[model samples]
Target: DTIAAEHKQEASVLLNLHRNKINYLIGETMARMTSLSIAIDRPVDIKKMQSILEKTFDEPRFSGLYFLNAKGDVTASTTELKTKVNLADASFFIKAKETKKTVISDSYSSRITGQPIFTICVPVLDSKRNVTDYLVAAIQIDYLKNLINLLSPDVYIEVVNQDGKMIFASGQASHAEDQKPVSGYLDDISWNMKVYPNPVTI
Candidate 1:
């Protein structure tokens, strides 16, 4: 019983640290997207917009930066999209359009790259101060998985969405009642993480 209590305490600390790291990643991405939204506020030409996106695509955290028009057509992108794509049906785009606020999407595969990712969408305003476009940044799930593994190489960690769907997991999950797990929800997004202590050998 004492060992279980101690394991839970240490796992809680690790969970908090990981939560802060994940929140920071989301917060920083939102800030970058917000700045880009301002830079393209005046309805620049599509070519220029694409150039602007390309300039900000060097980060490992982002799969791509995109500019979507009022109709949800991909007007510009950091990566060359061989075929046209529309985000009108994308939940993140729809939410940002309706709410006129930044939105973090549920995990989905990128239409352009076929990589599993999520998007941070920020609304772009027109001269009349109405939202008519969006600035989007896509974050790769693989990058996040790698980050968690790198940070806690020996622990069992699992991430799940709001609906209790597993997003990421490391190490074998235990179902025995004796195992204690420390779980917490992230502040910036609707995801939760559970960390289980290494099984006690004693």
Candidate 2:
């Protein structure tokens, strides 16, 4: 709900600090999406926006990108295919349209491929900044886990869902109850990401 933490890493636990950094990465990603958010009013601008998204070849963490009109219709996307998908019923789209703020969605199966995934979105507004569209990025769990594994080789991490189920674990896997792990909230998607020493190995 808020972007209060910007890689703000001053935690008692090192893994908590890592969560801070990961959330920061998430924040930085949203900033990039917002930067690329240009109106589809002009042909040239749409091309330019598509070009920017195409450059995501350098950003493997992002699985897909989308530009959706006010009605939650696809306008442009990374692949240039603009797959005709309706996001009107998606909570992420509805919330961003309602609040006019960027949103990070809870994990769910991909709408396109039926693969597990989550999305990040920022609303696009007209001249008066009234909501008109949503700029979105669908992040695959594997992409994020790969990033987390790379950045965190020293400690074990677990990304837990609201239901207290483990979704992804990296480094050293330990029972959450035994770890007494430090916790941080990914405010955008509302996931609980925690880290603690791998009791068996460390």
Candidate 3:
């Protein structure tokens, strides 16, 4: 009926609006990664890198910033890591090394903190264009959940990756049972969002 149509239209508009905001958040992180990649120097001073990371640290969203040497050893970081952690096996790190470019990876738990996170990896290259180091920006998914719920408090919002894996969902899982969602893909990353206009009968 007309009610259904109206909800559909509203959901589509809201989905687009939220998508833009999410894209901007990720885009800002990517820009920071690129800028930091340029700022770091050769010879990789651990003390200097630690100072720089501490200066740039932001809360809730950016959980940590790390400098990984060619061997994937965490030389410096914003977190108070007890010892150097090797991330040579990390997917994002490997991807950045192979591609020699910036890479945003799917969600995963942080080995150091045990918190859910995703990484933005920027490869530091030498004059010959070979990867020398990596600048990693860790983003918290818990922060993202809080952000989405704050943005669309009364509606049903769900976020997923390119492969249709759940990233974040707002409100109760029971509400999404039978209703169709108005969904669209994000521009900066391989993620998409779905929205339902009416979450409750009242």
- Per-candidate TM equals 0.92, 0.77, 0.91
Q: Residues 1-202, candidate 2, lDDT per residue (tens digit)?
A: 1111212232235555556766887888887877766533533365656666677534666668877878988776765443478888999888898899988888888777577778889887777878877788887888777777887765567889888866688775533435556676676666788766434431
lDDT of each: 0.84, 0.71, 0.83
User: What's the lDDT of the predicted structure labeled candidate 1?
Assistant: 0.84
Relative to the true structure, candidate 1 has a C-alpha RMSD (angstroms) of 1.9
Query: For candidate 3, lDDT tens digit of each residue in 89-149?
Result: 9988888889898988888899888898888888888889989888898999888888878
Candidate 2: list runs displaced more than 4 Å. 1-13, 38-45, 56-58, 80-83, 151-155, 172-178, 200-202
The root-mean-square deviation over C-alpha atoms between each candidate and the true structure, in angstroms, is 1.9, 6.8, 2.0
Candidate 1 wrong stretches, greater than 4 Å: 174-178
Worst 10 residues of 1 by lDDT: 171-180
